[PDB]
Design a protein around this motif. Structure first.
Motif, PDB file in Angstrom:
ATOM      1  N   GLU A 152       0.803  -1.203   0.000  1.00  0.00           N
ATOM      2  CA  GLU A 152       0.000   0.000   0.000  1.00  0.00           C
ATOM      3  C   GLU A 152       0.852   1.277   0.000  1.00  0.00           C
ATOM      4  OE1 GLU A 152      -2.219  -0.076   3.817  1.00  0.00           O
ATOM      5  OE2 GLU A 152      -3.867  -0.113   2.469  1.00  0.00           O
TER       6      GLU A 152
ATOM      7  N   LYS B  12      -8.202 -10.867  -5.495  1.00  0.00           N
ATOM      8  CA  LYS B  12      -8.186  -9.407  -5.532  1.00  0.00           C
ATOM      9  C   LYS B  12      -7.233  -8.939  -6.645  1.00  0.00           C
ATOM     10  CE  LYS B  12      -9.555  -8.930  -0.738  1.00  0.00           C
ATOM     11  NZ  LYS B  12      -9.236  -8.456   0.616  1.00  0.00           N
ATOM     12  N   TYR B  52     -18.712  -4.123   0.463  1.00  0.00           N
ATOM     13  CA  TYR B  52     -18.079  -3.714   1.711  1.00  0.00           C
ATOM     14  C   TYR B  52     -18.961  -2.806   2.549  1.00  0.00           C
ATOM     15  CZ  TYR B  52     -13.588  -5.604   0.008  1.00  0.00           C
ATOM     16  OH  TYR B  52     -12.595  -6.443  -0.416  1.00  0.00           O
ATOM     17  N   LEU B  55     -18.279  -1.893   6.112  1.00  0.00           N
ATOM     18  CA  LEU B  55     -17.035  -1.186   6.405  1.00  0.00           C
ATOM     19  C   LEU B  55     -17.092   0.287   6.013  1.00  0.00           C
ATOM     20  CD1 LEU B  55     -14.476  -3.812   5.045  1.00  0.00           C
ATOM     21  CD2 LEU B  55     -15.626  -3.769   7.238  1.00  0.00           C
ATOM     22  N   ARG B  58     -15.222   2.783   8.096  1.00  0.00           N
ATOM     23  CA  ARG B  58     -13.853   2.493   8.517  1.00  0.00           C
ATOM     24  C   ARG B  58     -12.918   3.466   7.796  1.00  0.00           C
ATOM     25  NH1 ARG B  58     -14.023  -2.972  10.279  1.00  0.00           N
ATOM     26  NH2 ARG B  58     -11.784  -2.994  10.721  1.00  0.00           N
ATOM     27  N   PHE B  60     -10.124   3.236   6.318  1.00  0.00           N
ATOM     28  CA  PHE B  60      -9.468   2.683   5.141  1.00  0.00           C
ATOM     29  C   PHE B  60     -10.460   2.459   3.988  1.00  0.00           C
ATOM     30  CE2 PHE B  60     -10.220  -0.927   8.108  1.00  0.00           C
ATOM     31  CZ  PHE B  60     -11.074  -1.698   7.341  1.00  0.00           C
ATOM     32  N   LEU B  64      -9.800   1.366   0.094  1.00  0.00           N
ATOM     33  CA  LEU B  64     -10.087  -0.033  -0.126  1.00  0.00           C
ATOM     34  C   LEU B  64     -10.878  -0.150  -1.426  1.00  0.00           C
ATOM     35  CD1 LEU B  64     -10.349  -3.004   0.569  1.00  0.00           C
ATOM     36  CD2 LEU B  64     -12.230  -2.396   2.121  1.00  0.00           C
ATOM     37  N   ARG B  88     -11.488 -20.359   4.708  1.00  0.00           N
ATOM     38  CA  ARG B  88     -10.788 -19.321   5.454  1.00  0.00           C
ATOM     39  C   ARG B  88      -9.450 -19.840   5.997  1.00  0.00           C
ATOM     40  NH1 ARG B  88     -12.550 -13.970   7.997  1.00  0.00           N
ATOM     41  NH2 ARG B  88     -13.143 -13.326   5.849  1.00  0.00           N
ATOM     42  N   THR B  94      -6.494 -12.920   7.766  1.00  0.00           N
ATOM     43  CA  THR B  94      -6.737 -11.784   6.892  1.00  0.00           C
ATOM     44  C   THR B  94      -5.491 -10.881   6.809  1.00  0.00           C
ATOM     45  OG1 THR B  94      -9.094 -11.919   7.244  1.00  0.00           O
ATOM     46  CG2 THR B  94      -8.155  -9.686   6.751  1.00  0.00           C
ATOM     47  N   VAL B 112      -1.445  -6.154   4.799  1.00  0.00           N
ATOM     48  CA  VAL B 112      -2.898  -6.339   4.899  1.00  0.00           C
ATOM     49  C   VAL B 112      -3.679  -5.642   3.776  1.00  0.00           C
ATOM     50  CG1 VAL B 112      -3.199  -4.424   6.548  1.00  0.00           C
ATOM     51  CG2 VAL B 112      -4.856  -6.320   6.519  1.00  0.00           C
ATOM     52  N   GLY B 113      -3.198  -4.479   3.320  1.00  0.00           N
ATOM     53  CA  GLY B 113      -3.848  -3.774   2.220  1.00  0.00           C
ATOM     54  C   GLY B 113      -3.631  -4.351   0.829  1.00  0.00           C
ATOM     55  N   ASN B 115      -3.641  -8.084   0.251  1.00  0.00           N
ATOM     56  CA  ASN B 115      -3.712  -9.433   0.819  1.00  0.00           C
ATOM     57  C   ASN B 115      -4.385 -10.451  -0.123  1.00  0.00           C
ATOM     58  OD1 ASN B 115      -6.457  -8.874   1.142  1.00  0.00           O
ATOM     59  ND2 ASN B 115      -6.528  -9.714   3.262  1.00  0.00           N
ATOM     60  N   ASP B 121     -16.863 -14.851   5.439  1.00  0.00           N
ATOM     61  CA  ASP B 121     -16.593 -15.131   6.853  1.00  0.00           C
ATOM     62  C   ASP B 121     -17.621 -16.055   7.508  1.00  0.00           C
ATOM     63  OD1 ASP B 121     -18.670 -13.291   7.319  1.00  0.00           O
ATOM     64  OD2 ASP B 121     -17.451 -11.879   8.456  1.00  0.00           O
TER      65      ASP B 121
HETATM   66  C1  LIG Z   1      -8.129  -6.732   4.129  1.00  0.00           C
HETATM   67  C2  LIG Z   1      -9.606  -6.418   4.341  1.00  0.00           C
HETATM   68  F1  LIG Z   1     -10.195  -6.404   3.070  1.00  0.00           F
HETATM   69  C3  LIG Z   1     -10.398  -7.281   5.332  1.00  0.00           C
HETATM   70  O1  LIG Z   1     -10.606  -8.608   4.892  1.00  0.00           O
HETATM   71  C4  LIG Z   1     -11.689  -6.479   5.454  1.00  0.00           C
HETATM   72  C5  LIG Z   1     -12.459  -6.686   6.735  1.00  0.00           C
HETATM   73  O2  LIG Z   1     -11.559  -6.539   7.851  1.00  0.00           O
HETATM   74  P1  LIG Z   1     -11.995  -6.991   9.329  1.00  0.00           P
HETATM   75  O3  LIG Z   1     -13.067  -5.980   9.675  1.00  0.00           O
HETATM   76  S1  LIG Z   1     -10.465  -7.061  10.574  1.00  0.00           S
HETATM   77  O4  LIG Z   1     -12.553  -8.512   9.156  1.00  0.00           O
HETATM   78  P2  LIG Z   1     -12.034  -9.996   8.692  1.00  0.00           P
HETATM   79  O5  LIG Z   1     -11.519  -9.737   7.297  1.00  0.00           O
HETATM   80  O6  LIG Z   1     -11.043 -10.541   9.731  1.00  0.00           O
HETATM   81  O7  LIG Z   1     -13.217 -10.942   8.608  1.00  0.00           O
HETATM   82  O8  LIG Z   1     -11.253  -5.100   5.385  1.00  0.00           O
HETATM   83  C6  LIG Z   1      -9.924  -5.008   4.880  1.00  0.00           C
HETATM   84  N1  LIG Z   1      -9.038  -4.478   5.925  1.00  0.00           N
HETATM   85  C7  LIG Z   1      -9.026  -4.781   7.267  1.00  0.00           C
HETATM   86  N2  LIG Z   1      -8.125  -4.112   7.954  1.00  0.00           N
HETATM   87  C8  LIG Z   1      -7.510  -3.311   7.003  1.00  0.00           C
HETATM   88  C9  LIG Z   1      -6.461  -2.377   7.152  1.00  0.00           C
HETATM   89  O9  LIG Z   1      -5.871  -2.062   8.189  1.00  0.00           O
HETATM   90  N3  LIG Z   1      -6.132  -1.771   5.928  1.00  0.00           N
HETATM   91  C10 LIG Z   1      -6.726  -2.071   4.722  1.00  0.00           C
HETATM   92  N4  LIG Z   1      -6.279  -1.422   3.623  1.00  0.00           N
HETATM   93  N5  LIG Z   1      -7.699  -2.968   4.583  1.00  0.00           N
HETATM   94  C11 LIG Z   1      -8.052  -3.529   5.758  1.00  0.00           C
END
Ligand SMILES: C[C@@]1(F)[C@H](O)[C@@H](CO[P@](=O)(S)OP(=O)(O)O)O[C@H]1n1cnc2c(=O)[nH]c(N)nc21
Ligand SMILES: C[C@@]1(F)[C@H](O)[C@@H](CO[P@](=O)(S)OP(=O)(O)O)O[C@H]1n1cnc2c(=O)[nH]c(N)nc21
Ligand SMILES: C[C@@]1(F)[C@H](O)[C@@H](CO[P@](=O)(S)OP(=O)(O)O)O[C@H]1n1cnc2c(=O)[nH]c(N)nc21
Ligand SMILES: C[C@@]1(F)[C@H](O)[C@@H](CO[P@](=O)(S)OP(=O)(O)O)O[C@H]1n1cnc2c(=O)[nH]c(N)nc21
Ligand SMILES: C[C@@]1(F)[C@H](O)[C@@H](CO[P@](=O)(S)OP(=O)(O)O)O[C@H]1n1cnc2c(=O)[nH]c(N)nc21
Ligand SMILES: C[C@@]1(F)[C@H](O)[C@@H](CO[P@](=O)(S)OP(=O)(O)O)O[C@H]1n1cnc2c(=O)[nH]c(N)nc21
Lengths: 152, 152, 152, 152, 152, 152
Positions: A152, B12, B52, B55, B58, B60, B64, B88, B94, B112-113, B115, B121
């Motif tokens: 990123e 992705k 999404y 989210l 959120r 991000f 995203l 999973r 994740t 993580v961004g 991934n 889920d």
């Molecule tokens: C990668 C993701 F697409 C996740 O799959 C999805 C839901 O996150 P979460 O709410 S922790 O739920 P699970 O995926 O564990 O089920 O949002 C993205 N995401 C999560 N944290 C971050 C971050 O810090 N930065 C960026 N860029 N994307 C993030």
């Protein structure tokens, strides 16, 4: 920045002898880490005693040095986010008995004295190991074509 | 029956760009899951905002959506016993930092961004995702030749 | 330009049933071709009769159409320099008996009526096949991150 | 001594039918274990009832025996340090639901009644299984060319 | 004698950028060739002009030099019976259009100006290339543990 | 009928010692051939002299017999359409110098006296070799789950 961290990875003489060089490098490439440096040598006894200076009083030390000098090694530097800690996870536990399937040691070796590979245990250790094994000009600066799809 | 469960898996844009489509599909085939549906598209921003929707507040989220629209994705439906939960596990955590070697994210990505892949889920989320991404007629009904060697 | 050529590749029902989808896609990705379109479907008899219209009077035609309808196929479009002719080389000879090891048919199948995959035989045939199997909007425009390393 | 330990590994009829024989043997070879014995057979009901005598009152037993007789198995003996316990780690949990990616069951199967492979659970069980499945003269004594690179 | 022949193999900047280093090395290891030397560097324009001195009047030469300088290469020496001629077969034709599936170029690249790898064309050229790219002390003398299983 | 043809394939002691048993078996399984018989043994000098009776006056014969007795072999029977002739193609030329990349010998060995594998040269030779190396009861009758996807 954090994405510029480096670690030292060495494939030990058993890893070379057992034909694992390509397999190990592929693991690092496919993960998204950037190869910074690489050379192939038979490390001298003196060089290895310096590498293992902390262990000079351990009972296994003379045998360790002899084994590490008993064939060539592949010395490498790899770059990326948390590459020291993540590199160690990819290698598996130092003792292959405890290394999980999916890791380098878990998939490919058995005994701690023949554990195919080394990775730095810390950033401080990495920088010391890099200085010992490489000249500064052997570390190549270039940008991976997929960098913006890895970070990123 | 329990063996008729389905999950939604999307590769992705980074997974496509880094040439991992074949490798990921192979993981699901070799496990014994049945491919039900598959298409390749650049998902619109409106479509992604719906995907999404949970989210949307959120920090991000804008980034995203932009990243998820910045290249094509491979959208899939896979069927099998506990395919949501097991899918999973196969993907890994994740956050790739925490994904173990042997998992898709553990083997193939870092941050993580970026991934590489999504998996539903929960069963409830899977059915919502399948309805969003696919027309009912795009889910194909056929029986795997090895079904009776995969299931008692 | 010459690098914008496209071909139609379909993985036939036997290729899907025998779990070769990932392996085949990986061959095209690793070569440096760009995936333009992909979908998974059970092709109707009418659709297949149009695809094979040149063969409609051949004695094997009824059986060919029945087999091609007997499970889903993966339909794809791939882009790159000479992708039609090179794609055919990658597949191997239409008769697997004559396909060399290293090719898709050579590695993975035995008999001509179960030959796992189709590739367009010419640019003209490719454009006809692409129009038949895909809607225009299903062909995705994006640029590979490694394009400048595959092409001068 | 410890490096001479042996285990019994059997690829079950589903593992043969699903084309996993080579992939499983490769996992054992690449680790550094020595193949001691191998044969391919349809095990009789009487033979299987003896192999599974401790399970004869479990509700799944009649079905287990029928499945284990429903096609051929690959029976093998492998040698190495902690090969019984490490072999079991490599296979994964007996129930594929709990088998981690990277293990044989984790990568390649789904349900407990179709769990592709058996490994001895203890040295005592291994020696019993080896005696049951193999004639003494079928265990081959040879030394791996890489032995001194696998063991100190 | 004949088993001591050496060749020079270089992975070109595109091979590094596209993540093929491990895959290429594995091909040489699995064949039974011995890795003698290896390093990783950005070759200077002056160095490359010497390497390619015989091409200095070809119309593609200025671009070739720039491309060969545009990222690091992996430079290697490999030993074995007929390794020059066999190495060239393993690489495939220098023009990827003509490289067969199963070869390095056939599997992994498309266009002549991005053809991922170099191998010496003759023993005379190999010895010249080795002298140009390596210091004598960078060529490591060791014996493969499987040497007597590769050679009578 | 034609699909019931069988051939004899043996992995020679060098192929076992170099860890190629899994890799070779996988090539046969993924092609669609059926494994009929398999065992692992050190073939006696007397047995080998019978196998190689046609070569008894060739200057390399004493060495050939000693090498073929110097470690265990994997003996196999494989079934399928034209499996004798196609098996030979998959192995590559008897002399590895002439074996193409993508074949077993092309990918994995170097010299004629260490050429890792044997395949029957004709149906007549196959039946003779099967009678020599196997008891009739060691040839297992079962039907592959994918038979109707491999054969019309
Ligand atoms: C990668 C993701 F697409 C996740 O799959 C999805 C839901 O996150 P979460 O709410 S922790 O739920 P699970 O995926 O564990 O089920 O949002 C993205 N995401 C999560 N944290 C971050 C971050 O810090 N930065 C960026 N860029 N994307 C993030
Ligand atoms: C395998 C090693 F090279 C380790 O890398 C290094 C330091 O190990 P340590 O400081 S305990 O921890 P790491 O951070 O490197 O895991 O000494 C080696 N080593 C450790 N224990 C043994 C042993 O019993 N026998 C033999 N033969 N070598 C051993
Ligand atoms: C496998 C095929 F689909 C070919 O791709 C396609 C075009 O025929 P052609 O012009 S000869 O092929 P190419 O040179 O384009 O490969 O017809 C099919 N086909 C050909 N011969 C036979 C046969 O005896 N039995 C069955 N069952 N299908 C056959
Ligand atoms: C798969 C197995 F062959 C096990 O290895 C073995 C011993 O089971 P256990 O006593 S739990 O011991 P470990 O494998 O942990 O040593 O019985 C089989 N098995 C276990 N549970 C089930 C079941 O529900 N259905 C069917 N069909 N087979 C089952
Ligand atoms: C690929 C190459 F590196 C060749 O290895 C080397 C010697 O070529 P040649 O004299 S045909 O000899 P061999 O390849 O048969 O050894 O020049 C390069 N080369 C050849 N044609 C072209 C071209 O059109 N454009 C670009 N960019 N590079 C080209
Ligand atoms: C490698 C072989 F086992 C061949 O399979 C087999 C039959 O020879 P031929 O009848 S000429 O070949 P095929 O019918 O199997 O193609 O003799 C062996 N052989 C042939 N030439 C040589 C040699 O110079 N040195 C050594 N050491 N073994 C050799």
């Amino acid at each position: 920045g954090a994405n510029l961290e480096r670690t030292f990875i060495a494939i030990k003489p058993d890893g070379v002898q057992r034909g694992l060089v390509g397999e190990i490098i592929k693991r690092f490439e496919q993960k998204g880490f950037r190869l910074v440096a690489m050379k192939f040598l038979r490390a001298s006894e003196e060089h290895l005693k310096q590498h293992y200076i902390d262990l000079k009083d351990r009972p296994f030390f003379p045998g360790l040095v002899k084994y590490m000098n008993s064939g060539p090694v592949v010395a490498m530097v790899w770059e990326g986010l948390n590459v020291v800690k993540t590199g160690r996870v990819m290698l598996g536990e130092t003792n292959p008995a405890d290394s999980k399937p999916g890791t380098i040691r878990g998939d490919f070796c058995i005994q701690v004295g023949r554990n195919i590979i080394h990775g730095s245990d810390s950033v401080k250790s990495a920088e010391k190991e890099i200085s010992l094994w490489f000249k500064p000009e052997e570390l190549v600066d270039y940008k991976s074509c997929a960098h913006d799809w890895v970070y990123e």
